[PDB]
């Protein structure tokens, strides 16, 4: 997280760390949605340009973490992937359209004070919350500068930008399945996700029922916290039908 802040313990109990078995390293962020499902970006598992194409047995999921590198005994829990599911219509070739994937843990993880799932939104939630100006929150253990690594989980609250501004910030064809967030150059404040953060959650707390809902997944960005650039996120709700069908098809 560029221009973020140190997370408080249990502030983001649904935060997941995609961890490479060998070499042991951070791959991306991810989120706990149920006791057997972790949500992340499809590009964390498959992105041919960067030569990325992981299989279940290549990854470990580390849940309950706060510290970046330290194995937090008695606090975190590490799970193995049973099956990975990537959106059948995810466009890695062109613009990372439908950048989302699900990972089914080999066995359910026990919730605790540091491990707890995030709610996925429904039509009405997305409707009332996903509006330009509204601040969501992004968290991660990735780069603190576009071009070090943090010691602890970082957090930054970023406002949702208008579709027009997003489109007018890049040459990439933006789709309805995406939204961008971040502060404008004149807005004073700044902040953004960065390498190591992708696949992670963009959550908002509903002022109606006080729950945290994941509206977005850190998808892509040009650099990290640049003037005039924005972070792009997978529109979680627009693809919930794919999430529902997958979970109530092979899920538990």
């Amino acid at each position: 997280i560029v221009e973020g802040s140190d997370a408080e313990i249990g502030m983001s109990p649904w935060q997941v760390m995609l961890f490479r078995k060998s070499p042991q390293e951070l791959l991306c962020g991810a989120s706990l949605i149920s006791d057997r499902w972790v949500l992340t970006a499809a590009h964390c598992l498959l992105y041919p340009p960067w030569d990325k194409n992981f299989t279940e047995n290549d990854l470990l999921v580390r849940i309950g973490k706060h510290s970046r590198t330290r194995y937090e005994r008695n606090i975190e829990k590490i799970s193995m992937l049973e099956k990975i599911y990537i959106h059948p219509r995810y466009n890695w070739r062109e613009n990372l359209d439908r950048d989302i994937a699900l990972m089914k843990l080999k066995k359910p993880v026990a919730f605790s004070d540091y491990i707890h799932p995030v709610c996925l939104p429904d039509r009405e939630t997305a409707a009332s919350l996903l509006q330009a100006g509204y601040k969501g929150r992004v968290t991660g253990w990735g780069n603190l500068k576009e071009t070090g690594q943090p010691s602890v989980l970082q957090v930054v609250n970023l406002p949702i930008v208008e579709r027009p501004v997003c489109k007018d910030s890049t040459r990439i064809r933006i789709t309805d399945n995406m939204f961008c967030a971040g502060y404008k150059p004149d807005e004073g404040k700044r902040g953004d996700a960065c390498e190591g953060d992708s696949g992670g959650p963009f959550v908002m707390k509903s002022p109606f029922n006080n729950r945290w809902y994941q509206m977005g997944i850190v998808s892509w960005g040009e650099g990290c916290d640049r003037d005039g650039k924005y972070g792009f996120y997978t529109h979680v709700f627009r693809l919930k039908k794919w999430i529902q069908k997958v979970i109530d098809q092979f899920g538990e």
């Binding site: 078995k21 042991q24 390293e25 470990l60 590198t69 194995y71 590490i78 193995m80 690594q149």
Partner: peptide, 10 residues
Amino acid sequence: DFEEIPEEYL
């Protein structure tokens, strides 16, 4: 610079 995790997870 990651800390070794329990071999049990491999």
